[PDB]
Amino acid sequence: KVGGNYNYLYRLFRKSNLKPFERDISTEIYQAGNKPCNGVAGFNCYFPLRSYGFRPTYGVGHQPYRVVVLSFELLHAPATVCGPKKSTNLVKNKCVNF
Amino acid sequence: SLTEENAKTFLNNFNQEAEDLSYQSSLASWNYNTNITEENAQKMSEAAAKWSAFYEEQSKTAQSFSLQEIQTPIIKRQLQALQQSGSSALSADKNKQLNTILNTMSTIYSTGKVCNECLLLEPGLDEIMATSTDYNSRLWAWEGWRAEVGKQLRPLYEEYVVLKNEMARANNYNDYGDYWRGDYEAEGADGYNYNRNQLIEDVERTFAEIKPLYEHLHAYVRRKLMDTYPSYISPTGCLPAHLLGDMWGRFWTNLYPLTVPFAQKPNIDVTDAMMNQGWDAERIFQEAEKFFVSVGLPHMTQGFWANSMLTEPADGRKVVCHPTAWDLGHGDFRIKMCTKVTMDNFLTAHHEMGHIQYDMAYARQPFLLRNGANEGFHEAVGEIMSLSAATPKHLKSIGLLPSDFQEDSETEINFLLKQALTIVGTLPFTYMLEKWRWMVFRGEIPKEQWMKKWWEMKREIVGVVEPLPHDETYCDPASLFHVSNDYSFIRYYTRTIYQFQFQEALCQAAKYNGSLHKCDISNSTEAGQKLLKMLSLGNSEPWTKALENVVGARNMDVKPLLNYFQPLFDWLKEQNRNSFVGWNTEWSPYAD
Ligand SMILES: *[C@@H]1O[C@H](CO)[C@@H](O)[C@H](O)[C@H]1NC(C)=O
Numbered sequence: 001k002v003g004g005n006y007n008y009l010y011r012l013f014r015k016s017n018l019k020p021f022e023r024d025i026s027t028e029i030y031q032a033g034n035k036p037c038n039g040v041a042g043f044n045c046y047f048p049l050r051s052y053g054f055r056p057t058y059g060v061g062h063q064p065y066r067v068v069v070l071s072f073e074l075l076h077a078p079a080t081v082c083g084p085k086k087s088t089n090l091v092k093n094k095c096v097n098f
Numbered sequence: 099s100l101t102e103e104n105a106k107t108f109l110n111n112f113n114q115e116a117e118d119l120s121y122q123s124s125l126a127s128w129n130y131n132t133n134i135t136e137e138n139a140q141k142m143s144e145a146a147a148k149w150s151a152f153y154e155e156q157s158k159t160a161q162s163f164s165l166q167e168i169q170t171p172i173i174k175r176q177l178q179a180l181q182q183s184g185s186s187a188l189s190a191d192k193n194k195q196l197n198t199i200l201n202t203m204s205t206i207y208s209t210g211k212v213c214n215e216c217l218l219l220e221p222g223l224d225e226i227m228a229t230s231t232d233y234n235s236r237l238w239a240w241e242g243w244r245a246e247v248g249k250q251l252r253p254l255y256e257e258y259v260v261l262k263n264e265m266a267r268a269n270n271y272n273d274y275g276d277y278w279r280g281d282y283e284a285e286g287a288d289g290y291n292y293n294r295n296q297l298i299e300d301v302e303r304t305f306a307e308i309k310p311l312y313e314h315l316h317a318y319v320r321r322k323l324m325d326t327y328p329s330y331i332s333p334t335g336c337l338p339a340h341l342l343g344d345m346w347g348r349f350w351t352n353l354y355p356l357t358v359p360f361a362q363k364p365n366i367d368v369t370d371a372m373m374n375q376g377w378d379a380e381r382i383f384q385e386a387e388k389f390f391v392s393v394g395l396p397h398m399t400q401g402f403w404a405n406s407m408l409t410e411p412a413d414g415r416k417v418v419c420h421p422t423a424w425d426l427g428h429g430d431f432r433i434k435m436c437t438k439v440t441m442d443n444f445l446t447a448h449h450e451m452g453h454i455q456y457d458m459a460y461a462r463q464p465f466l467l468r469n470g471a472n473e474g475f476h477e478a479v480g481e482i483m484s485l486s487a488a489t490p491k492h493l494k495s496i497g498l499l500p501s502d503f504q505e506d507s508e509t510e511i512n513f514l515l516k517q518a519l520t521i522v523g524t525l526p527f528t529y530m531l532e533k534w535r536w537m538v539f540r541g542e543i544p545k546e547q548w549m550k551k552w553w554e555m556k557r558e559i560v561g562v563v564e565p566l567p568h569d570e571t572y573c574d575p576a577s578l579f580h581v582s583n584d585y586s587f588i589r590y591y592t593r594t595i596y597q598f599q600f601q602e603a604l605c606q607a608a609k610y611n612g613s614l615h616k617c618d619i620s621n622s623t624e625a626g627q628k629l630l631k632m633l634s635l636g637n638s639e640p641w642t643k644a645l646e647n648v649v650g651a652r653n654m655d656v657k658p659l660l661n662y663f664q665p666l667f668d669w670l671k672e673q674n675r676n677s678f679v680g681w682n683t684e685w686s687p688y689a690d
């Protein structure tokens with residue numbers, strides 16, 4: 001948006017790194033220093049979720065990019081997602097491979 | 099639990115917020131510059147005020163992290179680049195007084211007029227001082243200007259100096275001169291450490307080597323002006339201040355029609371050759387992009403061709419109509435210029451594209467380090483591009499000059515003389531003005547001997563004598579734009595040194611056999627990757643280390659400057675045989 005698409009957020013500060021396929025939606029103040037934060041922002045108490053300043057005037061490295069990740073799971077359970085099967089025509093009065 | 103990681107997190111948050119706030123401020127400034135209106139001006143003012151408030155708040159908050167505990171060098175440098183307060187050190191009353199004095203001086207300098215015709219500074223005075231050749235027609239204007247503006251700015255400048263010294267002392271410095279020289283202060287290893295006091299000793303050493311060339315040039319200019327000014331020039335004296343082609347004497351380029359080595363072979367101009375081929379602004383920008391890509395630099399962004407205003411708008415928009423390279427951030431690099439099909443604009447396009455490519459280099463560094471090494475690097479990186487693109491070989495390679503043309507000696511001598519009248523003639527003036535301002539700010543020159551010592555330095559350093567006596571009632575230093583409005587002036591000398599240093603360093607790496615002024619960095623990728631090594635660092639490393647990456651030296655070097663004009667130096671030394679190179683500091687046009 002010309003004015004700015006500030007609807008997309010991103011987490012910048014956190015205690016420790018995440019685990020594979022883990023989600024965190026907490027909005028608690030990042031306790032940086034020893035000072036116990038009391039829900040207010042300021043010195044050593046920063047908000048973890050920041051916003052994107054998406055604007056069309058950006059270059060090629062800061063524009064919004066949509067990323068999809070397709071992960072396949074092949075547990076011992078029977079598979080129910082197979083690829084598209086091919087097909088052919090029929091044959092009459094001739095021994096072929098069916 | 100250590101303060102290092104806390105400072106790192108604080109700097110990360112500060113950079114994350116700055117990359118948005120400064121971007122919005124630059125966008126508002128660009129919107130104001132495109133269409134100058136009242137609403138856009140108000141929006142730009144509000145954005146600048148918000149950015150300044152955020153920056154001063156973050157600076158006040160960052161002063162609680164002393165650099166002694168920070169072990170990481172880059173984090174310490176980022177904290178040092180922000181802990182500097184500046185004008186906020188003074189109290190509210192002193193800051194208001196300084197701001198009012200600055201605004202009053204700026205208003206007096208901008209609204210100055212000299213009448214006994216009745217004109218102003220830019221409309222009539224500049225054209226007269228540039229083109230007119232009459233003694234009185236220039237003398238009266240010069241005297242009126244330096245008697246009105248000087249006497250109107252003297253009482254304000256006297257308090258301005260004291261307020262700036264108080265601000266410097268409040269900012270843990272000593273004087274305003276040290277605060278201005280603090281930009282060249284480097285920190286690092288034992289070999290990559292530079293001090294503010296060392297610049298005072300190095301500038302004089304670098305100026306001591308350019309003295310014979312400047313003396314020969316001054317003698318040649320005097321001998322050539324003896325014809326047009328028969329009864330106003332001494333054979334062993336200085337030159338008047340109103341006969342230098344400018345109100346102050348900063349650029350001697352206006353003396354080229356009067357001081358020409360060979361008039362029967364004028365300079366090379368590709369204006370008509372560019373008009374015949376049907377070129378335009380976009381063609382000039384495409385040729386500049388091709389030149390910058392041939393040397394081995396990254397390619398220009400797409401938004402540079404869509405969002406940037408390369409040509410003058412025909413929609414009735416009022417632009418300031420002067421070249422500027424804007425770096426809004428996040429991959430936004432634009433050029434605002436009154437570009438035409440002329441040759442000077444053709445070179446200014448490459449000069450600004452150099453600054454743009456510089457901005458496109460240090461973008462990977464943190465926001466607190468997204469700037470050049472010093473004030474002498476950013477403007478010198480772009481100048482070497484214009485110096486290498488204005489050669490007769492590049493014009494023939496691109497197609498502006500036909501192949502049947504051959505390089506002549508007289509044309510090269512005339513070109514070198516015209517370039518020295520603008521590049522070599524300004525260095526003594528800059529050095530003298532900076533030395534005067536340093537000795538005034540440091541309190542070495544009493545307030546009762548400003549004009550006396552100023553004119554004594556004009557006689558000893560620049561070799562300029564006043565045509566009429568001016569006592570301490572005037573203030574001629576304050577008559578300059580850079581002196582009236584708060585701005586640094588030592589950056590020009592360092593820029594002039596570093597541009598020749600970079601030119602020589604990039605020409606010796608490409609194995610070029612010829613004159614230094616006829617170099618051509620085109621079709622040489624090795625000249626780009628060696629330059630980007632300094633362009634990609636910016637302010638993340640001390641300026642000595644960045645300078646060593648290109649030329650190898652960790653300080654200023656004037657030998658490339660003397661090697662650039664070596665044929666011109668020999669020609670001047672051979673032509674000035676029947677004369678005395680120098681000037682005596684006793685002759686006076688006002689005295690009989
Ligand atoms: C610039 O401002 C003028 C003055 O109102 C207006 O006529 C013109 O349409 C504006 N141009 C743009 C591109 O906004």
Ligand SMILES: *[C@@H]1O[C@H](CO)[C@@H](O)[C@H](O)[C@H]1NC(C)=O
Pocket residue numbers: 492495618620621
């Ligand atoms: C660079 O090389 C190309 C191809 O050989 C040539 O057309 C062009 O004129 C060269 N440019 C210079 C400046 O030598």
Ligand SMILES: [Zn+2]
Pocket residue numbers: 421
């Ligand atoms: Zn400029």
